[PDB]
Design a binder for this molecule. Structure first.
Ligand SMILES: C[C@]12CC[C@@H]3c4ccc(O)cc4CC[C@H]3[C@@H]1C[C@H](CCCCCCCCC(=O)OC[C@H]1O[C@@H](n3cnc4c(N)ncnc43)[C@H](O)[C@@H]1O)[C@@H]2O
Ligand SMILES: C[C@]12CC[C@@H]3c4ccc(O)cc4CC[C@H]3[C@@H]1C[C@H](CCCCCCCCC(=O)OC[C@H]1O[C@@H](n3cnc4c(N)ncnc43)[C@H](O)[C@@H]1O)[C@@H]2O
Lengths: 285, 285
């Protein structure tokens, strides 16, 4: 046999890299169901798989759109092993921009994919894990799920939502033998979508010039943060592996400790003033 | 003139009490638009208003379903003053039960109401506040938005989402003169809906007996927490007033410090293990 892993959002970034990392593991201990919202995006996954010489049958792609419980259920049915040892909820959407410039549908979609989609995955796969008294659920988290980032209001809302979702589940799942962990990622080097945001023109047309100016500042700041802190997806994917291998996985794994300090500041001040002030200064100088 | 307040979810609980608290303020400084998802539920609001002798015109009810941006926009248009000084995003849904027993629609609805609904409110009213360089936005938060509670996975996800949403906005709004604050409520004595959850039978039919047993334990625990810590809505509503009166409102106001300790435990351990273990023991003995 093998550790059956099913990962959502494997078209790019972390999910893609994790899928191939697992499938190509020298031990051949993993059987990966790299699921993708749209199978038409599986090319990079297969290119990466081949690059890592994933043995035939180590990696299988399934369509799995986490917005669709039917898709979730259909993918689950495609797990020939009849069990998922490791469920990686990585499907996600970003949403960047002045809150008032974000389309309502875009906002809804982010919550639907990031939060409800993860809920759908958990509803579909948790029961069997609880029944077996075993199973690892890894959820791609973000430091933006731990601290608010201007112009990422909805994205952060969704990532924070995952924190609440997973933490709540973790409290319950403790004695079930089902381990849920969030892999708290910082910026990761991944060239994938999200550019559906909106051109400067459309953004400026949906917000005020001051907010737009701040948005620019945030973007400039974000570029710097990525330029300085973005991790390779391989390093991040390895954190998932680490969480997977841990006999007693913690609720959270950080891919970086870079933001722990800013994070510590949030509990040091539950009023949130310290964080807000510090982050405003951090982002806007 | 007067401080124009528009509150969502005034049919009961905090929103109702806040609306009438504000409308009946002895100073008559507030003009309250107590908005309700369904105007058919405005009876208790008017009963409470009359009980507090809210002066005629101090309180006006508007239908405002935060799931509907058209409703949001229509209510906003009904603000005759043409400005909202204080926007209170209180509309919310609860959702309690084993994650796998929760209907997908129910899950979506909780995020839609609690998170997207608040986003809709902010999209509708923030722009004018930013334009004016003034405005207070109070968002009903929960301690469940700060720490995960078993069987409240989605509820907590939504409340945590509000934390991320508001914190992200707060970082941006700092220099705009627009103050966003979360009123972090513990258990509040409020007999209102949420009993759409599902009978024990339906819950048990959608989960395993062990989870169901834990659910009972959680319910018993929750009953005890409410019996011991539930605050009157008047005390909680007053925290909104306090946040409103603060010249430099913090991002968060706690209605109680009762849970600060459990909360401190989350940052003391970013892995989340301490919290999960402590809360599991707290809830399940
Ligand atoms: C917050 C952050 C850490 C903290 C950083 C920071 C820290 C401090 C500071 O001062 C500033 C900043 C700014 C940058 C911040 C970072 C921004 C980074 C996040 C950026 C937004 C990322 C957006 C990518 C969203 C996509 C993402 O996460 O995609 C994962 C996979 O999901 C599949 N996918 C999409 N929809 C799907 C579906 N319906 N069904 C199935 N799969 C689906 C996709 O196709 C894909 O394959 C990181 O989390
Ligand atoms: C987490 C918690 C604090 C921590 C407590 C704790 C702490 C430690 C521990 O060990 C255990 C526990 C267990 C209980 C926990 C508490 C449970 C409490 C939360 C309970 C769930 C509350 C559910 C009520 C949801 C409704 C709620 O919040 O309703 C507010 C208003 O929203 C309107 N409303 C509804 N839908 C609407 C719409 N579409 N448009 C406009 N308005 C709408 C409504 O009609 C209404 O008027 C509290 O937050």
């Amino acid at each position: 046999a093998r550790t059956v892993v099913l990962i959502t959002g494997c078209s790019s970034g972390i999910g893609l890299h994790l899928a191939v990392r697992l499938a190509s593991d020298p031990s051949q201990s993993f059987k990966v169901y790299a699921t993708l919202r749209d199978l038409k995006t599986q090319g990079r996954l297969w290119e990466a798989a081949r690059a890592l010489a994933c043995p035939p049958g180590s990696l299988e792609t399934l369509q799995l759109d986490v917005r669709d419980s039917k898709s979730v259920a259909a993918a689950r049915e495609r797990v020939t092993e009849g069990r998922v040892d490791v469920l990686v909820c990585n499907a996600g959407l970003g949403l960047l921009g002045p809150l008032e410039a974000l389309g309502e549908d875009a906002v809804a979609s982010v919550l639907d994919v990031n939060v409800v989609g993860t809920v759908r995955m958990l509803q579909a796969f948790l029961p069997d894990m609880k029944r077996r008294g075993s199973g690892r659920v890894l959820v791609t988290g973000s430091v933006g799920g731990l601290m608010g980032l201007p112009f990422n209001d909805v994205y952060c809302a969704s990532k924070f939502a995952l924190e609440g979702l997973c933490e709540s589940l973790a409290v319950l799942l403790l004695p079930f033998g089902v381990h849920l962990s969030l892999i708290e990622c910082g910026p990761v080097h991944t060239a994938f979508m999200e550019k559906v945001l909106g051109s400067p023109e459309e953004v400026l047309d949906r917000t005020d010039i001051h907010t737009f100016h701040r948005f620019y500042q945030y973007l400039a700041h974000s570029k710097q943060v990525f330029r300085e802190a973005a991790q390779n997806p391989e390093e991040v994917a390895e954190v998932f592996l680490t969480a997977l291998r841990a006999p007693k996985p913690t609720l959270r794994y950080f891919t970086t400790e870079r933001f722990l300090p800013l994070l510590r500041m949030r509990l040091d001040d539950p009023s949130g003033s310290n964080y807000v002030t510090a982050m405003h200064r951090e982002v806007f100088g």
